[PDB]
Amino acid sequence: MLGNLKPQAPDKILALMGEFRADPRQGKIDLGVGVYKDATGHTPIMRAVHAAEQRMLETETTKTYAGLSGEPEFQKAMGELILGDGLKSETTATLATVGGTGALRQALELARMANPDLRVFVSDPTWPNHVSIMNFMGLPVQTYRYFDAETRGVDFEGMKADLAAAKKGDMVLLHGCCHNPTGANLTLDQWAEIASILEKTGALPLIDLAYQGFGDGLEEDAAGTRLIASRIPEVLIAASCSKNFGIYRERTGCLLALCADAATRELAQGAMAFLNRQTYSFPPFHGAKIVSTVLTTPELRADWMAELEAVRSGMLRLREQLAGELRDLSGSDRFGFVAEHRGMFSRLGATPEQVKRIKEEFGIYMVGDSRINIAGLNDNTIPILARAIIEVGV
Template sequence: MEFLIPTRTSRPSDDPIFALNTEARARAAAGEAIINATVGALLDDEGRLSVLGSVAQTLREVPPNVGAGYAPIEGDASFLKAVVADVMGQRPEADWTVAIATPGGSGALRLAMADFLDTGQAALTTSYFWGPYRTIADELDRGLATFRMFDANGRLDGADLEHTLSAQIEAQGRALLFINSPCHNPTGYSFDADEWRQLAAIVGRAADRAPVTLLIDIAYARYGQRSLDEAVDALLGLAGRALLLFAWSASKSFTQYGLRVGALLAVHPDPEARRRIRSALSYSCRGTWSNCNAGGMAAIGRALTDPDLRARTDQERAALKSLLDRRVEAWNSLATDAGLRYPRYDGGFFTTVFCADAFAVAARLKEEGIFVVPQTGALRVALCSVAERDIPRLVQGIARHVTR
């Protein structure tokens, strides 16, 4: 007798990235010389999780009654105000912004899928994408469609985006577009100013025909070479024509992956539209996770607003970014010399090597003690977790199988 509903009977029990990480860690613990370039957590060159000391201290200083209590369903008001300021700065459009607390960036993505698409409809994203986008869609009985991410010049393929977005509007009468930049997961690609303007123009034309929601996933933005302000300034002109969302996360920017603190920001000039959006998102929170980590919001909110603490946090994060930037520089030098094909990569946790038989290559690399994440047409390489001294072996290993 089967108690699960039919659509749930064949689901995998573990995320494939976490499964690879578990295998890599077990082999390393057994004494093998393993390069584990799988999970998106920033490690130092000795393999220890990098943690911002200022944030850890702030967490310890959260009063017990605050950490133990229920947070408001929408999230702590001072935390949400701080997150809005973190993204919007002093722009007047901050007053147009609704913010709802979520368990990490994943919670923000889930809210968007649940409330801006109907059952059976599909979100749209780049052809290379973070695998859980599809998992979240599947869990909500939504779909996930893609457009070709790169054109022949290795830049945003605006023509295919516009064509695919138009087809989605024709098919379902609305669209939800996920864009992850700066520091795209999995490719490491960051849009430049021209690409942000191109995106805004495409979405604006589509929004003249039907409701279009554009979500910018900014989980890795703090580690990019280009400022998030470049994206915000280019996209704010869409507010009122399209709905502009930002999926914000403390996981990477504050090195608190397990704290599960995030937020979804929605920008719209009409107060009545904002009221409806806030109500719908709050209702979804109550029906899914109820409320978020009160102690985590208190600590992150303080890290964002206390001037001395914010200065310390920014300084510590800059040191971690420098660590990562050295790895990026080493990778770019060695991978280019080795003839590897990969997108423009100037910062962030990941890069992606184009590879026709990625799953077979990843299996062979695993036999050699090199763990990467295969996907259709590419290998994701998490440089965030690879010591700088191991990058030559990593590049050489990949090159042996990809360029031969």
């Protein structure tokens, strides 16, 4: 029977890796990486995180089955982290999931469970995993203009124009902050207008919050998400702890369902718990416990925020340097957008030909859509990248 199986395509990330490793050039650089890397090219375990694992190793007395939808300490902590003082427990349903991706899938299942004729609107472009999951579920997918290839900024007129076509019941997927892969983001005023459009059309917003803390800070990054939650009655939030806590492999995230009333919250909560059960039953414990421990322990929480901040400022300085270099070399303010983008990614806006030429001539690797990881840059690599960009006619 298994022979009938249709061949499924590889991740592609590995294909990028295999090529890079095979490159015999000693000066080769890799900007296609999708995780945070420090000065030495390592992806360290945050201090507080290592502190929580020591604490857990000495205090945990059993590993029996726990909460089906997550432990309360984690649910409350995450909600407060994302929504701050605005968290209305009475109408908020929470589900610990296997990473933010698990959160996305579950939100998709829940929405389709409540509305069979669901259509999803995704930005152009967006995280490929989004479209992939949707295609897999058989859900209809619609696109809304987002990245402006010329200015490398947000095409807000087009975004509004396209979202205006959403009907009540449809789902609109928004990146809370640090748009992956572009790096181009919406300002709070633009979020306010998006809110109006969402109220008008009656579409359900699904906010993918995976980089809280890598943009302008923890609170600032959650600002957009908080405006939507306060103005829109029903909101779905898929939060990831992978990057801002550096626990990628632990698989920790959570789905937040902001409802109109307590009765609906009870309905959504029951369905979420049901969904976990029909997929894997209980969610992973380790990472979630690390997170609640850091968040509830004043000392740890303080150190984590402090470390996250160092990371953020470090990347922000890298952006300014690259931008500075590009300005000095270009004799213009064309690549200024690099300094304006937020998050660890940025789409340069180079054509696949330019991307291929940059690799063949300069030994610099990046995703085929010209997305680079800011964290993979440094004092030695910045000048090279800048030169390459200017030389290939970007």
